[PDB]
Design a protein. Structure first.
Ligand SMILES: Nc1nc(=O)c2nc(CNc3ccc(C(=O)N[C@@H](CCC(=O)O)C(=O)O)cc3)cnc2[nH]1
Ligand SMILES: [Cl-]
Length: 159
């Protein structure tokens, strides 16, 4: 089954021109624990942002442009990306915006981090109908010595 994971600032903005103005190691830990040892799908731009494959995970990159690396799997379509992932219980889509958009219709779960930050950004997470989804988990955290902003984790399951 397909799962989407993302960190959202106020107004569902997932990023912009510049680096994100928050320090949230707690979110990174949450991200690792949920995606560890599972196939992860992402686009050309996210690849460029990280530069190297994510450890212990099966990296699948959706790109219309030919692949430039042998350590990760390169696909040209959504159907091909899902096939390259295999017959595993859970497959994660980790971005970016246009990729989340193509995968939302087929997602069964949403792992969201709601960050209390007013970030003026260009890219937004797709709008999802609240009625089509059930919030089976939500946990609120305040900012602390390690995390700069207050935030909440949420797991939604498709109805
Ligand atoms: N919750 C959530 N937080 C994110 O930061 C996030 N980032 C993406 C896409 N961008 C990125 C950028 C960097 C790494 C990365 O280098 N992660 C390392 C953790 C490093 C670490 O703390 O060891 C990883 O191994 O997962 C992953 C995704 C998608 N969904 C997200 N979702
Ligand atoms: Cl991307």
């Amino acid at each position: 089954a397909i799962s989407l994971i993302a960190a959202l600032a106020v107004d569902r903005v997932i990023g912009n021109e510049n680096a994100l103005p928050w320090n949230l190691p707690a979110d990174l830990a949450w991200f690792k624990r949920n995606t560890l040892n599972k196939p992860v799908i992402y686009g050309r731009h996210t690849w460029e942002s990280i530069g190297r494959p994510l450890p212990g995970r099966k990296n699948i990159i959706l790109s219309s442009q030919p692949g430039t690396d042998d350590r990760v799997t390169w696909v040209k379509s959504v159907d091909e990306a899902i096939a390259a992932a295999g017959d595993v219980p859970e497959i994660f889509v980790i971005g970016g915006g246009r990729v989340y958009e193509q995968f939302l219709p087929k997602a069964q779960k949403l792992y969201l981090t709601h960050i209390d930050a007013e970030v003026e950004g260009d890219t937004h997470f797709p709008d999802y109908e609240p009625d089509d989804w059930e919030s089976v988990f939500s946990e609120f955290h305040d900012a602390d010595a390690q995390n700069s902003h207050s935030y909440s984790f949420e797991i939604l399951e498709r109805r």
